[PDB]
Design a protein around this ligand. Structure first.
Ligand SMILES: COc1ccc(C(F)(F)F)cc1N(C)C(=O)N1CCC[C@H](C(N)=O)C1
Ligand SMILES: [Zn+2]
Length: 139
């Protein structure tokens, strides 16, 4: 579990979104596994605007942060689940890093701010849904 709070927005994995997220929907994209809902309280997370390929992510299954090198956002094949059929997930970045089911939602950050959230992995890999291209999160 986990979310990004920036301005009047909450960014979560689309497969983990709640009834409240869907009743206050701003934008969602099944191909990115993202959903953004509106909030009453003001969020203070800073979104990174960069092409960093190094950062640190929070891994709940180890209660630890890990430094990682990660790939550029791209279309990557993802296995079927109770939430999606087998498909290409867009704007996904992979790193060699552990992860298990509930790790979805952990933040990846670089020196500039929030880069994205854990959305994939499996077999010793973890993937991140990138949010750096969503320029409207700041306004
Ligand atoms: C880092 O995520 C994982 C962690 C562990 C596992 C494992 F292999 F153990 F079952 C799997 C994953 N994945 C990849 C995963 O949870 N899903 C399931 C829900 C939908 C997510 C999506 N973006 O489509 C993909
Ligand atoms: Zn950066």
């Amino acid at each position: 579990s986990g979310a990004i709070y920036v301005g009047n927005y909450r960014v979560v994995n689309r497969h983990l979104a709640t009834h409240n997220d869907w009743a206050n929907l701003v934008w969602e994209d099944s191909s990115r596994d993202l959903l953004v809902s509106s909030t009453t309280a003001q969020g203070c997370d800073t979104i990174a605007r960069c092409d960093c390929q190094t950062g640190v992510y929070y891994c709940s299954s180890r209660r630890k942060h890990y430094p990682v090198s990660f790939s550029k956002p791209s279309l990557i094949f993802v296995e079927a689940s109770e939430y999606y059929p087998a498909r290409y997930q867009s704007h996904l970045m992979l790193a060699v890093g552990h992860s298990e089911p509930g790790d979805c939602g952990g933040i990846l950050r670089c020196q500039h701010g929030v880069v994205g959230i854990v959305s994939t992995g499996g077999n010793g890999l973890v993937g991140f849904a990138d949010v750096r291209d969503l320029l409207w999160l700041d306004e």
